[PDB]
Amino acid sequence: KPCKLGDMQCLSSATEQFLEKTSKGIPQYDIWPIDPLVVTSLDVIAPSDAGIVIRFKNLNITGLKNQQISDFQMDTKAKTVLLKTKADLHIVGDIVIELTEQSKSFTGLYTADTNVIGAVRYGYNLKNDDNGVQHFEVQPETFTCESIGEPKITLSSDLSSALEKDSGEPLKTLRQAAICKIAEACYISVVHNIRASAKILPASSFFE
Ligand SMILES: [Zn+2]
Ligand SMILES: [Zn+2]
Ligand SMILES: [Zn+2]
Ligand SMILES: [Zn+2]
């Protein structure tokens, strides 16, 4: 069902609604599964020390079906979109904490329960079908990680036991950066799906 140009509140729901309905995928439309969302790997540099690298593998992320689109601005002369969200993400994956300057690494599992608030911005333009029908075309966006709330992080006990036995923010800052990096991959994926719906439906569809 269409919105009426201008009504920002109408949109957020259409999107949330799109995200939930399609969130497990639809290959033929290039709509990616985003709940659960799988990230093959993601690397993260310690902000307080570039010799320290967190290597995530197999991140499995749930929660994105349900995120709220709590703010939605479409500017028509500049043709750009600002939008804010919150997701409660449950994250699980393999982790390798790599201390490059010490020639060692520690391995195990990682789990993070966090509520993330962010901002996606992109511009867009109008463009035609082969039949001359107009679609929106959404352009490469940027993602700003506005906050991560107060995360719960757990390390598998083999790892946390290895860490303790070795040392027997940077913290804050490192924990923050990992969540933001992960949130960022999450939203590259969200917007991919927004971008994809825009290919699947005439611009006319999205407003009255
Ligand atoms: Zn794609
Ligand atoms: Zn909502
Ligand atoms: Zn939770
Ligand atoms: Zn078309």
Residue numbers in the entry: 7 to 174, 183 to 222
Excerpt from the publication:
JHBP adopts a unique elongated β-barrel fold, consisting of a long spine helix (α3) wrapped in a highly curved β-sheet, which is suitable for a transport of the hydrophobic JH. The uptake and release of JH are regulated by the opening and closing of the α1-helix over the JH-binding pocket that functions as a gate sensing the ligand entry.
The crystal structure of B. mori JHBP in complex with MPD was solved at a resolution of 2.6 Å by a single-wavelength anomalous dispersion (SAD) method using selenomethionine (SeMet)-substituted crystals. The MPD-bound JHBP adopts a gate-closed conformation which is similar to the structure of the JH-bound JHBP. The refined model contains four JHBP monomers (A, B, C and D) in the crystal asymmetric unit, which are related by 222 point group symmetry. For all the four JHBP molecules, we revealed two bound MPD molecules, one (MPD1) in the JH-binding pocket and the other (MPD2) in the second cavity at each end of the elongated structure. MPD2 is partially solvent-exposed, and is held in the cavity by a water-mediated hydrogen-bond network with Tyr116 OηH and Arg189 CO, and hydrophobic interactions with Ile60 and Phe62 in β2a, Ile101 in β3, Tyr116 in β4, Ile159 and Leu161 in β5c, and Leu185, Leu189, Arg189 and Ala192 at the N-terminus of helix α3.
